Design a protein around this ligand. Structure first.
Ligand SMILES: O=C(O)c1ccc(C(=O)O)nc1
Ligand SMILES: O=C(O)c1ccc(C(=O)O)nc1
Ligand SMILES: O=C(O)c1ccc(C(=O)O)nc1
Lengths: 117, 117, 117
């Protein structure tokens, strides 16, 4: 899975090791191995969420097969909100998630695409 | 109900009173009175969870009738996770639960088995 | 949470399963488990809302901890209006909400009160 987390929390208000703990969390939530989880955290940004500049965070989640239905994404959302509200000390009104299905021909790995691996 | 909690948190990082609070919580969650709840806490163990020796806990829950279905246990799990995350200051990736149905002929109580009470 | 919805819509103009979908929405909005959400719908009543007998609904919401501030209730209101206007086919002017904090000693469950659970 590919996870990108944008936040207006400064780096020194994002707990040490979050990018590693999000690999374990995404592995369990999405049912793919932790060694196939990719996380990017971009702290210190200027953000408004629901019109408000109080501390907040945005997560994008991309994967083949498992983020393409409302019913699957409902379950995924519940678990990611539980994890991130606690880690970032944010209320559930201060986080939003977007889910993006991917296909194998879009993923460039070791100089080819996943279609040929 | 019968609850057994193993943790690699030392005893002095397990909050005082956890046993009676877990009796009350198990009454709320499983529906059987607090005075029928049995709790065993084993702290200071050497543990790995998901391959990692960071602080963690395992809970076993055994009961007649109420821990035997996926839909029952999904609900029970959500509540026991919320209870333990708060009490032990652990993330939900650092807790696992196992559920075990029991029958009356397996429970020895006051020198007989529950079949005869 | 405890939700009570009065409406002058006849029962056959309240969509089938509304009490179930409002349960799930209220769990999300209030940040409480769905197996702790209670919904009561009372249709076919004689009602005036804002002085008018046109189709309308009144919602009451009661919960520990999460319905006691203006800022929290503004957030909750926005989501409940978005849900109910669509489900009941009512304009924003035809719904009102009241929020009521509860305490643990007020809630009777399994023959005791939540103070002891
Ligand atoms: O090879 C990549 O790391 C990779 C490729 C695919 C997926 C995925 O579908 O989630 N995740 C990671
Ligand atoms: O008498 C015991 O304490 C007892 C016996 C049975 C059960 C139970 O099925 O949950 N719990 C407790
Ligand atoms: O455990 C009960 O069912 C319960 C307890 C509390 C609340 C509540 O605060 O809204 N709702 C339900």
């Amino acid at each position: 899975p590919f996870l990108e987390l944008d936040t207006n929390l400064p780096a020194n208000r994002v707990p040490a090791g979050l990018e590693k703990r999000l690999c374990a969390a995404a592995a369990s939530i999405l049912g793919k191995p932790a060694d196939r989880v990719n996380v990017t955290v971009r702290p210190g940004l200027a953000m408004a969420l629901s019109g408000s500049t109080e501390p907040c965070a945005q997560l994008s989640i991309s994967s083949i097969g498992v983020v393409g239905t409302a019913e699957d994404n409902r379950s995924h959302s519940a678990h990611f909100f539980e994890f991130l509200t606690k880690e970032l000390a944010l209320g559930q009104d201060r986080i939003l998630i977007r889910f993006f299905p991917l296909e194998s021909w879009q993923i460039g790995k070791i100089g080819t695409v996943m279609t040929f691996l």
